[PDB]
Amino acid sequence: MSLQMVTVGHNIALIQPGFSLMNFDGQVFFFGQKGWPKRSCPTGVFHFDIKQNHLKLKPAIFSKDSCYLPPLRYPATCSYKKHQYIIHGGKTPNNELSDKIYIMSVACKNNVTFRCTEKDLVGDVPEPRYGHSIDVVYSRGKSMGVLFGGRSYMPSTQRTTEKWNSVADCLPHVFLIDFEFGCATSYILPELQDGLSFHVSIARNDTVYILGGHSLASNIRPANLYRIRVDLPLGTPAVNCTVLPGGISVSSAILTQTNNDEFVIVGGYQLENQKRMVCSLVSLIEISEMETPDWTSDIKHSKIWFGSNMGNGTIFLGIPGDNKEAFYFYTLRCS
Amino acid sequence: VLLPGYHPFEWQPPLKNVSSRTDVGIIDGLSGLASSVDEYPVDTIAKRFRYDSALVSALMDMEEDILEGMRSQDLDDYLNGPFTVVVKESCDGMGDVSEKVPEKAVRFSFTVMRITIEHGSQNVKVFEEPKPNSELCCKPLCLMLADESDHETLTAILSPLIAEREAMKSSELTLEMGGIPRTFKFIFRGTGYDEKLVREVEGLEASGSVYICTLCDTTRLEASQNLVFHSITRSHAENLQRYEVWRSNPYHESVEELRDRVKGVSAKPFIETVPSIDALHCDIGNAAEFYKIFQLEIGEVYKHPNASKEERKRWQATLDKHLRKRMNLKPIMRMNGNFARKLMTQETVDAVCELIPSEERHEALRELM
DNA sequence: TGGCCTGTCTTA
Ligand SMILES: [Mn+2]
Ligand SMILES: [Zn+2]
Numbered sequence: 001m002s003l004q005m006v007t008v009g010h011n012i013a014l015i016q017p018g019f020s021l022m023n024f025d026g027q028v029f030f031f032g033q034k035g036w037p038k039r040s041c042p043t044g045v046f047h048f049d050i051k052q053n054h055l056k057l058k059p060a061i062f063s064k065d066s067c068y069l070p071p072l073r074y075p076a077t078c079s080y081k082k083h084q085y086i087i088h089g090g091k092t093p094n095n096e097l098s099d100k101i102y103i104m105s106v107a108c109k110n111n112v113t114f115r116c117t118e119k120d121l122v123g124d125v126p127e128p129r130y131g132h133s134i135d136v137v138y139s140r141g142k143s144m145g146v147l148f149g150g151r152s153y154m155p156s157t158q159r160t161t162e163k164w165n166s167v168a169d170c171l172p173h174v175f176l177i178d179f180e181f182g183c184a185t186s187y188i189l190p191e192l193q194d195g196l197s198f199h200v201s202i203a204r205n206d207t208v209y210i211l212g213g214h215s216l217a218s219n220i221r222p223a224n225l226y227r228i229r230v231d232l233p234l235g236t237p238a239v240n241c242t243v244l245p246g247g248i249s250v251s252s253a254i255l256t257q258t259n260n261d262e263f264v265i266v267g268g269y270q271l272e273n274q275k276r277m278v279c280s281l282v283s284l285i286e287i288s289e290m291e292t293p294d295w296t297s298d299i300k301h302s303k304i305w306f307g308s309n310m311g312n313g314t315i316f317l318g319i320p321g322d323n324k325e326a327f328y329f330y331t332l333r334c335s
Numbered sequence: 336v337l338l339p340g341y342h343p344f345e346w347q348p349p350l351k352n353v354s355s356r357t358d359v360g361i362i363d364g365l366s367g368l369a370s371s372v373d374e375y376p377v378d379t380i381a382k383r384f385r386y387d388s389a390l391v392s393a394l395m396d397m398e399e400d401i402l403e404g405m406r407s408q409d410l411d412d413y414l415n416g417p418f419t420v421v422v423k424e425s426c427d428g429m430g431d432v433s434e435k436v437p438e439k440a441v442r443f444s445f446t447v448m449r450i451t452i453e454h455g456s457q458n459v460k461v462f463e464e465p466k467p468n469s470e471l472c473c474k475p476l477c478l479m480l481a482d483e484s485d486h487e488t489l490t491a492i493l494s495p496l497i498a499e500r501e502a503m504k505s506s507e508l509t510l511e512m513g514g515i516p517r518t519f520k521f522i523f524r525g526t527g528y529d530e531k532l533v534r535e536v537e538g539l540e541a542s543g544s545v546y547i548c549t550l551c552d553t554t555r556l557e558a559s560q561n562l563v564f565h566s567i568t569r570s571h572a573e574n575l576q577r578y579e580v581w582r583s584n585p586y587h588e589s590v591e592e593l594r595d596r597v598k599g600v601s602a603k604p605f606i607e608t609v610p611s612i613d614a615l616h617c618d619i620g621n622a623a624e625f626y627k628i629f630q631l632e633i634g635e636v637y638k639h640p641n642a643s644k645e646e647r648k649r650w651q652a653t654l655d656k657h658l659r660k661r662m663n664l665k666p667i668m669r670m671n672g673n674f675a676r677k678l679m680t681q682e683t684v685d686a687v688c689e690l691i692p693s694e695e696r697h698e699a700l701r702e703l704m
Numbered sequence: 705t706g707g708c709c710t711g712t713c714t715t716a
Contacts, residue, residue, distance in 0.1 A: 010711095016487075017375055035486045036602035039540060040710060042590050065587045070603070073375060091375070094490045094605050118583075131373070151369075161353050161502075162385065164495035166367035198373045214373055252373045269372045304376055320376070323436065543710060669716045 001264075001279070001293040006316075006329040008055045014046070015318060015327060017304075018073030018130075021048060022085045023311025024106050030057060032071045036093045044071045045104075045114060048310075050331065063107040066116040072098060076134035076147065078203070082106070086136070086179065088147065089129045095165070097152055099128035103179070119179055124186040126175050127152050133210070134177075135203035139232035145177035146208050146230060146239075149196045151216060169195025169216045174228065174239055189241045192226065194218065198251040200265060204284050206230050211282075212250035212268070221270065223249035227285070246287055250276050252306075258313045258335035264290065266307075266315050266332060275305065293332060339388040342395050345509040350387065350502035359385050364477050366495040381479030381492050383443075386499040391510060393447055393474050394420070394519065397462065398512050401450060404461035410454060415517045417507070418461070421449040424500070425473065425527025426493075426536075426606075428483030443477040443493060446527075483532060490605055497606055525608040536606035537571065538578050539599050546599030549610040571607035578603040615672050622675030625704070629687045630654045632696060653690065661686040679704070 008015070014033035022029050030048040037044035041059035049056045062068065072090025075098070080086055085104040091097060100118055107115035132150025136143055151167045153159060159166075172192040176185045199213025210226040225247030231238045253268035253276065261284050267276035277300070279290045299305065299319055307317030315332045340360035349355055364381025384392075394401070402412055423446040432440045450462040464472050477496060481488045500523055508519040530542060533549050540546060545554045550567045558565065577600035584593055594601070634650030636642060655666035662683055667674055677683070684704045688697040 035484075036538075038710080039544070042594070042601065062590065064589055065584075067584060068581055068593070068601075070582065092603070093486050094603050095487065095494060096603075156352070159352055161366065161495040161498045162359070162362055163367035164352075164498060165365065165369070165491060167369050214371070272372055304372055541711080667716070671716085 001290075001332060001334050003293055003295065003299075004053055004331045004333070006050060006053050006055050006331055008329060009057060011040075011057050012055075012325070012327065014057060015329070016073070017306040017318075018091065019306075019308060020072075020075065020077055020087075021308040021310050021316060022077070022104065023079075024083065024085075024112065026312070027112065028310050028312075029060060029112075031087075032073055032075075032090070034071075034093075037068075037071065043068060043114070043116075045116075047112070050316075053331070055329065061113050063113050063115045066107075066114065067102060067118045069100075069102045069116055069118070070098070074130035074198075076129075076132045076150070078135045078145075078201075080136050080143075080179070086134060086145065088134050089126075089132055089150065091130050097128035097130060099125060101177075101179075101182075119182045121177070121182045121184055123184045124175065125184055126173075126186075127170060129170050131197035132170070133199060133201035133208075135201050135208050137203060137206050137208060137230045139206040139230055139237075142232040143179075144230060144232055144237065145175075145179055146203070146228065147175040147177055148172070148201075148208075148210065148228075149199060149213065151195070151197045167216070169197055172196060174241070176230070176237055176239070185237070187239045189239070191241045191243055194222070196222075198268070200250070200253050200255050202255070202263060202282060202284070204261075206232075209244075209282075209285055211265075212248055212253060214251035221249045221251050223247050225285070225287075244285065248280055248287060250280075254307050254309055254315050254317070256309045256311075256313050256315055256334060264313075264334050266293075266317075266334075267305075275302075298328065299330070337392070337396065339384045339392040342391055342510070344387075344391045346387065346503070346506045347509060348506055350499070350506055353385070353387065353499055353502050357388065357391075359388055364479055364492050366492070368491055375487070377488075379479055379481040379485075379488050379492070381477060381481070383477030383492075383496065384475075386476060386496050387503060387508075389445070389474065389476055390420075390422070390503070390508070390521070393445075394510060395512070397447065397450075400462050402513060404450075405452065408452075408459050408461060410452065410459065410461075412513065413515050414452065414454070415515055416453050418517060418519045419451050419453070419458070419522060420447060420519050421451075421522045421524065422446065423448045423467065423527055424523050424525040426525075426532055427527070427529065428532070432480070438480060439482045441477075441479045441481055441483050441489065441492075442475060443479075443496060444473045444475045444527075446472050446474065448524075484535070486535065489535075494605065525606065526611050528608050528610065530610070533608050533610045536604065537569075537600075537608055537610075538574050538602040538604035540601060544599055549608075552598040571604060574600050574604045618672060618675045618679065619670055622678050623670050625679060626654075626670075628700070628703070632687070632700065633690050635692075654687065657690055658683070658686065661689070 016034040019032040028048040030046040033044050043062045045060045047058040047060055070092045075090030076088045078086045082105050087102040103117050105115045107113045129150035129152045134147045137146050150170045152170055172195050174187040194215045196213040196215055200211040202209045208228040214221050225244045226241055227244050228241045250268045253265045255265045257263050263282045265280045270276040278292050281288045281290050302319045305319050307315050310316050313335045318327045318329045338360055340358050343357045361382055364383040370377050425444045429440040429442055431437045448464055451458045451460045479492050503521055510517055547555045551565050552568055577597040581597045581601050630651045633654050658664040684701050
């Protein structure tokens with residue numbers, strides 16, 4: 001795992017904490033710019049090209065049948081196999097939380113244009129949230145989305161302008177979501193007692209593993225690991241969760257896929273005052289510590305760090321500038 | 336006594352999502368924004384009043400003027416019938432505040448503009464501010480250490496205030512003046528927003544856009560060709576719906592077709608403004624046009640359609656020199672109020688006609704002025 | 705390889 005500094009072009013200001021990267025056919029794209037989209041790029045979606053350790057953001061266009069979704073911070077995203085991306089939730093430039101679901105696909109590639117379609121949701125729609133997970137599980141030749149966790153504003157009855165921005169963890173209900181028709185079913189599980197946000201999520205076959213996270217009520221970053229199995233018979237699905245020992249304690253960690261069936265997670269925040277400098281390896285479930293990479297002193301002495309998974313087993317991370325550039329960016333590679 | 340949070344009051348019906356506690360003063364401008372290392376990074380410190388409590392303190396501050404104005408209109412001190420308070424709402428960034436890196440600040444403030452009382456079925460004014468634009472009557476509501484173009488932070492900090500003001504738009508305020516309970520109801524008019532902040536809070540594009548007006552849907556080309564017949568069209572609701580249209584692309588149009596459909600509204604509005612004009616800018620826009628007309632009438636540009644840059648420059652120099660000799664006007668390169676005030680005179684037109692050959696065009700320039 | 709449409713920086 002080698003660390004590499006990156007320089008950025010004129011629109012470095014667009015990058016902010018909560019951004020996302022999506023990988024389409026080896027090409028990387030960036031979503032969730034700071035501010036509302038400007039005339040220079042009306043969609044807010046960018047080709048994310050790092051050539052010779054230099055990052056260029058190039059405007060991407062949407063198809064005629066697309067939504068123009070707002071930039072979103074901390075939405076739950078996953079990849080769905082045409083190959084497409086699922087966006088649910090997030091914060092808007094106006095600080096509203098979106099409950100909507102957007103679906104991204106490559107509509108046309110000339111020398112890329114995207115199709116962005118919103119899927120309406122009925123039934124037990126999850127309250128709009130950020131900092132939550134969504135993945136796709138496969139059971140008996142059927143595909144279903146699993147959504148869990150996060151935080152949101154207070155409900156309209158208790159919300160008050162003096163604490164207008166105050167947040168609480170969402171109730172820890174598992175949500176099954178059929179993307180074709182847009183339906184949602186909520187499952188209360190006895191093993192999931194507390195709320196959780198900014199956790200890590202790993203989906204394999206009919207299972208989703210939940211790692212780390214932060215629970216607001218206790219203000220604990222629990223060192224538990226949860227396995228979630230989903231069976232899809234012809235009738236109503238069945239979901240069963242089990243607690244597993246050996247769970248790491250980390251919030252806002254980043255996750256990437258090395259080779260096949262091996263995942264590595266690079267640090268997040270282990271305590272409010274402390275940062276998780278170590279890295280973990282998950283084999284599909286067993287967790288082993290890895291040799292910590294050659295962090296520079298700037299990374300070591302920063303209080304805040306943020307990043308995203310690029311797709312190619314490589315992480316794109318960023319650190320805040322000195323008091324006297326706004327951000328300094330690095331790329332950490334694996335495999 | 337003079338700070339918000341001292342006198343008791345009531346809202347009927349109680350304000351939606353606003354505490355009824357009346358002993359609240361200075362409160363954190365972040366309004367409970369999460370600050371953990373996981374959440375979005377908060378780079379700002381701000382402090383505010385709860386908008387209602389501040390209205391209460393400002394009215395109690397002006398109690399003496401209200402009673403005396405009631406007297407001055409030949410009305411009784413003890414009347415309590417519904418007073419209507421008009422309130423200019425205002426917002427500006429304050430540039431660099433730093434004491435010595437730039438440290439920018441936003442000030443959200445209000446001004447009590449007028450207070451009328453209802454006697455029978457005549458609305459008689461009991462008070463109106465003599466100096467609306469003074470720093471002195473601009474009551475501060477929130478001060479923050481942030482960039483007016485830092486949209487995420489701005490909405491995060493201002494949105495609770497707007498929520499409170501929305502709440503007050505449909506409620507009556509009961510407040511004790513001079514032993515007698517009096518009842519107030521408010522009309523909020525966000526007229527204090529310069530163009531940049533209007534565009535930012537109403538979901539519109541940046542100032543270079545083709546949609547040049549925040550009152551109408553004209554384009555720069557339309558407004559230039561169509562000189563005068565334009566009407567005020569836009570409203571906050573129309574802008575919230577035009578945003579939703581941009582967002583939903585219901586007729587599956589291309590980005591240029593969609594942009595023409597929503598006439599510039601590409602972001603979601605979050606403040607209702609009353610965009611106006613400054614008398615200064617009327618004078619300045621007119622004077623700029625007259626200056627160009629003067630220099631072009633000296634160069635006689637109709638006869639020289641392919642005139643080069645340097646010929647027009649010498650035209651400008653000619654006009655500058657002659658205006659310095661005749662009107663004592665130091666040519667400047669940035670248009671301002673005093674230049675406009677001295678140039679927009681009939682005598683200045685006579686002076687510039689002294690350099691124009693055709694007197695038929697003297698007729699036209701003088702009538703224009 | 706441009707006009708040149710857009711956003712940043714400069715000077716009165
Ligand atoms: Mn301003
Ligand atoms: Zn207009």
